[PDB]
Amino acid sequence: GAGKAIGVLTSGGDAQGMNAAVRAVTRMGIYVGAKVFLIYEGYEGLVEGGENIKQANWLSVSNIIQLGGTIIGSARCKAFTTREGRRAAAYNLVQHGITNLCVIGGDGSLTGANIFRSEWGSLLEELVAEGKISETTARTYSHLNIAGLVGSIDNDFCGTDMTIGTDSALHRIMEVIDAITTTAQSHQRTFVLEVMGRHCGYLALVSALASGADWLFIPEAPPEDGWENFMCERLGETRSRGSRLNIIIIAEGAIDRNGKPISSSYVKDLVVQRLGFDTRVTVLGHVQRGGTPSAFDRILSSKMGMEAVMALLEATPDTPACVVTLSGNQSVRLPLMECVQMTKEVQKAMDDKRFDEATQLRGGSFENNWNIYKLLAHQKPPKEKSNFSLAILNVGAPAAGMNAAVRSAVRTGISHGHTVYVVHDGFEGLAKGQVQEVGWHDVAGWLGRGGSMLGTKRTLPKGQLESIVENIRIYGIHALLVVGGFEAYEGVLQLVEARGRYEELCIVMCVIPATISNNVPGTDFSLGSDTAVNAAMESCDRIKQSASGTKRRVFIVETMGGYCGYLATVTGIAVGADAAYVFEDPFNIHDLKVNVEHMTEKMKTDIQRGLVLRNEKCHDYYTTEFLYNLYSSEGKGVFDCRTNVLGHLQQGGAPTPFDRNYGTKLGVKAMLWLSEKLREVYRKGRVFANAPDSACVIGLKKKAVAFSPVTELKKDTDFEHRMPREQWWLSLRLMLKMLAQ
Amino acid sequence: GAGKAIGVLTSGGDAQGMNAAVRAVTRMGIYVGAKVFLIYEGYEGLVEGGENIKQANWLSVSNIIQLGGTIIGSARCKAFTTREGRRAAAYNLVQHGITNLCVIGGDGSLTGANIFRSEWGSLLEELVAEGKISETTARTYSHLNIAGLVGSIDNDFCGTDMTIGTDSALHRIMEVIDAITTTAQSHQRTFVLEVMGRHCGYLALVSALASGADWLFIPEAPPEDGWENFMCERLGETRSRGSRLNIIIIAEGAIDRNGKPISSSYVKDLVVQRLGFDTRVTVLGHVQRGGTPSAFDRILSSKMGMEAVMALLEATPDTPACVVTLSGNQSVRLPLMECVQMTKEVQKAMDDKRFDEATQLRGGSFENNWNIYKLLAHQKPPKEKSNFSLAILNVGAPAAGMNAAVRSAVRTGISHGHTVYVVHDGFEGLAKGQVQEVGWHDVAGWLGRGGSMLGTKRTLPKGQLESIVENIRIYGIHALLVVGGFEAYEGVLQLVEARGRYEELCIVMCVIPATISNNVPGTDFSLGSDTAVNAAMESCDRIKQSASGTKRRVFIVETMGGYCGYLATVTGIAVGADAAYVFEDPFNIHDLKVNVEHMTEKMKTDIQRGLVLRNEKCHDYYTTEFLYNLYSSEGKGVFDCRTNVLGHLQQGGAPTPFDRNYGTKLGVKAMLWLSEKLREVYRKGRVFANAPDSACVIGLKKKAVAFSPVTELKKDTDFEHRMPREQWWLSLRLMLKMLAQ
Amino acid sequence: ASGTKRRVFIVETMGGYCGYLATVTGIAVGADAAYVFEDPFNIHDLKVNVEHMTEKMKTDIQRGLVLRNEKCHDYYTTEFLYNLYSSEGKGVFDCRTNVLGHLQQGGAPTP
């Protein structure tokens, strides 16, 4: 489908994840049939030419998808800014016949790339004038197409909600924070942390929100005058009220109202002078620029490389330079120039002290996250003292994140003045009582623990419905906020159709989807999915290393997730599995013969290794032992085979940054939705919830949050397979089969 | 065997692992029958008394073993130095009736504790004089017993090799270094790393050796005059000779000949001024003082905690205060004072600029490590250019550490002027040729990658022995260094036994044991065991968190190890398993019934979970599915059960600190012994090696390195099951059982 | 099998590695096939045999029988064949497995 050549480079500040993007672009460029060239040392080697530019084969980008940084340098060039460097680079490209380029880096690198594009024609004219090239060559390569990628941990590119590599940087910052928090709680010492980021406070805020830090500094919202006294009051209140440790996070470019940078040494001197608490400071440095890339990072980096290659092949000279970014939950494509000038407009906005205008220009999500952070950071004295009574339940299997969500919900409810109860062991608990009131201090520190300390059970409510109604009437509970998996959705549904028989079930209930399988309808991601994918990715990478150690071997892996195939597909994408067998993609024996022939052919190459996943219930009869026997027999003399079953190790340890933050966001928003619905449905001195809109599942759709009624989702659920009728992630399977030979 | 009370506390700089120490002490104290109290906030709460000291049950120390820092505070006290605070603490202890006390922390805390033992009688006299206590109480508590545990990552304590937590600090350091190396290679940047260690460079030395850094600065061997020229020469040589990045490590106590501190800022200014290379400086901060402790930290803390309990209960008043330390791989016991003055004298000698005397006082092991690091850091110009040739093999299952040993052996061999070959695919390749010489630069970066790059196979030599001898004669090989598992030892044994039938096999053969199962005879640790222990440690902790998520659950985990239960036993100790089944400990059905009823007893308590480790072939009929059926049957109505198989995940990813160091040290010392014997047996112009001492297995014995003849080990090897007759780790099974109820 | 129409049986006869017993009993009972060590077979032969069963199930004789010596192949277990025949034969017939164990040693000796 193509007959032209491709060039690729990464430039600017390295962010872990470029390796997956460069792998994807080169592998599609080969798969589509185009020629691909790797530019070493970035713009330095592009200008130098010669050995700095070289053709690559299908195997050139192997054994890098799990590696941070980049294999091709991405060094900063000075001659590129000059006319002589640009014409030399154009001379090198025409000598190698490069007409489409992919660039990875920051805003300046792409600005320079588009500057190079805007005068490519002029460069060809004077290059012909000096006699270096013939006019026929200039006519052949008369146009240059640019596709851009944003690789930077700062996440300052306002046109993209998530830049490549930030999730991995979020993993590195938080594991450092977790190590620091242990000694901080031990010694009762207040600490100041310095996170990376040129002039952006996204990383500082996300880390503080995911760690419950007692105070934050960001450039987007500089502190108001007299912040010293408010700092002293808050830290005194925290350490007095049982908070053993205090965490302070400061972006390297944090400023005051006058824009003057606030040095961490000043903050340390102030806290020591005014409180005398023992304290330290730890500058983290370049730790955010390294480590293994996150599974979401690898998936997104590969997907952006997929779209960049497609954009380059389908672009025209009249088409302006374009970048691929994220809007909602799809790979959108935006013009480079418009994002550049809007970023510069936000930059002058924060420079010109019009901080609010910079805030609205960049976006409205992070100001709301900052509002949630200030709400939950400290106990604001509640005044409402509303008669509403709420209960929180854990249902389903254990998963990463429910702890943060319940912590968010209880603290928000106490802030709202409601009486909050917490039920242990879910519906089985409610039948057997086991209900206690909770306080603000009673939930501290839950943000950093995986699983659910409250516990969960697979019991459904209809078996003990009478005891549930009795306990509801005894304790006067007026709302439910179940956080759990598919079984939570089933239980809430059964309660909904039970409303006609039992009048007390005319109550408001909401479900927070939390399960590793990601099979709860009404959402596009379930809380705890990302932790499970990260665990499976690490484990499969370790299996890949073991297989590569003993060459000519293949591994069978049995990933969990019931009938849903999301976990299998994302793991296979992250670790480059040669195939992923899934229930939604039926396959017969001839397909396995084809895959066996693929592996036998690949065994002739230098990369003599293989890894094929299998969702645990992808096929009724073709169990994992089937695949082991078939591969071992048909591959006799060529390779051997082994089996693995990733057990409950896929349920993860410490939760991930996105899961912690997403659980806190859903807990707050669900509590606001409850308080809303309760204050409408209260009439004549009693709560009466009969409309189906009183039973909804809070979830993040393609763009933002929604509240779909549970009964409305009944027409979109396969209760036999316990998974929704249609799922959005089926597109990624084409990508998974693409990235393998 | 006790009718008294035990007290525990932690003081000084927190070093992650005190949770394991207090767990083992508390659980051993309860098992022996002595009451146990947890003294919070260290010596501050000790003097304060009251609520700061409270009794602990078996469940008081549950679910803390995997936590960094400490759960009992460890605050610093000032009145503890004053006699008023001392008498107040003594009053608190006699009021709670505690006669024995276990101290955890650094040297100063031990000095204070010995002062307490030295004046306990005077304090009780003062309390009786003022009327606080009766005469009978004074007679009852007339003596105090002190047992000290050296918990400090600095590893300054002279009489001990490993203090509690130093391995965890090395784990933190190397996680950070592996993160940094990606971006440092990407941007071609030099990084100056500041390491902790109050006045010792052990952590700096071990990190530099395990990272292959370009230059090191420690206090034990301060740099000679004009060292800056050597800095410029080495850094220019590395950057010119293919070294993409440069790493410089500095101890926080680094000094010059005059003892003046060397600032990392100075080193950055010097390298920038004299070379202009882009560079950075990173300070790890207090990240090393927290985080989840590594597996070696937990096992070491548990053994020292048990030994401290034993020491306290077997002590007498005439006996002086003693501690528990490491000699070889056993818990030896030393007197407190002698080590204290030895450490003080070493510090004084370092301050007095007698740096040679300080080096001799630390121990010859450090000096040998310094010499090994100097030998391997840069390529010294060889001059001998002998006629000898060498071949290196990888055999057995791939184990994390083979690459480090191969790199060290190759570079040491190049230094001695021998031509060294590397045979891919083990003995199979040696029959199939594939033998290639290797240069210095050809093995760069192997230290930091797991697996086996040469490739390993389980094939044995006797099947292709004619082709083996043909290739030996063609390449003129004069010795083999076969690093590998039991298959390596068996293959070299076959070649030695075949020396009678052919002449060419009269050739010196050295074996480096490298296998996760730790079954090669003649050694105590096999290269790569520690990585597998740690990998299984994380896996089991993740399973236990999932288990606690679903209250009332038990897990059956099947771990590798061939027949040796070393891996299963140490992992079970690492994660507090209820029982670990192993071939070396025969078990019938009655023991399983006994374990089940014990599990039901535990399930009546608050901690409603469980875990059992099964070696992969601990029993020929009782497979893991049998155990699942038995447990799910006899626990019906009380709990459920699950099974997980840690397959090739137990081979681990990046090797841990000890495995990199152990691989490097074995590679150097094995190559030196090989060159020594090869020069010994060369006579009249032809090599001829017939005596049994010409074939040995390098291994770390109880104390230090020794070369055991390969044939002599035959009488201490079980070729039926592939493991030695006797193993040293059988004592650890007693710890595993006693620490569980 | 003939009683419950549309059914196939995988019979794992004894005999060690020798397939004399599996062959001759297959002739004596008209089995559809008798997999034996002396005749190595791959997945293609099993696919063909499934295809013969698929065609044969359209006729009046809606039954089948395939033998297998107990150790006729290292990997293709009787469970593997049961899964293969049931899966690729979905919608037309079902399958069951049997193991003629020490019944093969027989009762009273024949004349």
Ligand SMILES: Nc1ncnc2c1ncn2[C@@H]1O[C@H](COP(=O)(O)OP(=O)(O)O)[C@@H](O)[C@H]1O
């Ligand atoms: N305005 C520009 N015009 C031409 N080239 C540019 C421009 N800005 C950046 N570049 C090129 O990209 C390289 C990196 O730029 P830098 O400011 O360091 O970070 P980034 O490009 O990621 O924003 C520069 O060395 C230069 O070669």
Ligand SMILES: Nc1ncnc2c1ncn2[C@@H]1O[C@H](COP(=O)(O)OP(=O)(O)O)[C@@H](O)[C@H]1O
């Ligand atoms: N946890 C926090 N982190 C950072 N800034 C905070 C935090 N809490 C409050 N602030 C800021 O300090 C000021 C006082 O807090 P605020 O929420 O306004 O309380 P009040 O309603 O009494 O004025 C505000 O400007 C707020 O933005």
Ligand SMILES: Nc1ncnc2c1ncn2[C@@H]1O[C@H](COP(=O)(O)OP(=O)(O)O)[C@@H](O)[C@H]1O
């Ligand atoms: N690690 C991740 N895993 C899955 N999805 C993610 C991840 N990070 C970001 N996203 C998606 O991109 C969005 C970025 O989140 P953000 O803009 O910070 O605010 P919010 O999540 O509240 O919308 C997320 O909402 C999510 O849809």
Ligand SMILES: Nc1ncnc2c1ncn2[C@@H]1O[C@H](COP(=O)(O)OP(=O)(O)O)[C@@H](O)[C@H]1O
């Ligand atoms: N020789 C001593 N006599 C009395 N108290 C001491 C002595 N040494 C230390 N202490 C006290 O015990 C604690 C441990 O001392 P510190 O210097 O903080 O760390 P470390 O002793 O582990 O090196 C401190 O609170 C100290 O005041």
Ligand SMILES: Nc1ncnc2c1ncn2[C@@H]1O[C@H](COP(=O)(O)OP(=O)(O)O)[C@@H](O)[C@H]1O
């Ligand atoms: N790779 C290195 N890392 C750290 N220090 C080094 C290194 N190489 C040399 N030095 C320091 O410079 C000194 C000179 O090295 P040395 O082994 O004495 O070489 P030579 O004796 O042949 O001149 C060493 O004693 C050491 O202190």
Ligand SMILES: Nc1ncnc2c1ncn2[C@@H]1O[C@H](COP(=O)(O)OP(=O)(O)O)[C@@H](O)[C@H]1O
């Ligand atoms: N992580 C570990 N695992 C197993 N044993 C260890 C570990 N760390 C230390 N040891 C034991 O203490 C010794 C530490 O050796 P060290 O003091 O660094 O000098 P050297 O390696 O030259 O002998 C090791 O040989 C080993 O016996």
Ligand SMILES: O=P(O)(O)OC[C@H]1O[C@](O)(COP(=O)(O)O)[C@@H](O)[C@@H]1O
């Ligand atoms: O993913 P679901 O269907 O909500 O069920 C949750 C659990 O069920 C499992 O199958 C395992 O169940 P258990 O952990 O209870 O044994 C996993 O897919 C998952 O951890």
Ligand SMILES: O=P(O)(O)OC[C@H]1O[C@](O)(COP(=O)(O)O)[C@@H](O)[C@@H]1O
């Ligand atoms: O058995 P050895 O040679 O002592 O080495 C241990 C290896 O053997 C194993 O059992 C590997 O088994 P495989 O034959 O399937 O590779 C693991 O315990 C481990 O990887």
Ligand SMILES: O=P(O)(O)OC[C@H]1O[C@](O)(COP(=O)(O)O)[C@@H](O)[C@@H]1O
């Ligand atoms: O068949 P062989 O190998 O000649 O040995 C005789 C017996 O061995 C068998 O395999 C039966 O094995 P077992 O009686 O030990 O279970 C049959 O072939 C036969 O009944």
Ligand SMILES: O=P(O)(O)OC[C@H]1O[C@](O)(CO)[C@@H](O)[C@@H]1O
């Ligand atoms: O040492 P470096 O790489 O120049 O880091 C400084 C710059 O790196 C960045 O993180 C680039 O993303 C910026 O925040 C910062 O200005």
Ligand SMILES: O=P(O)(O)OC[C@H]1O[C@](O)(CO)[C@@H](O)[C@@H]1O
């Ligand atoms: O909080 P502290 O006691 O000052 O600890 C920092 C100093 O002690 C150490 O932690 C020793 O372990 C060093 O890292 C440092 O010199």
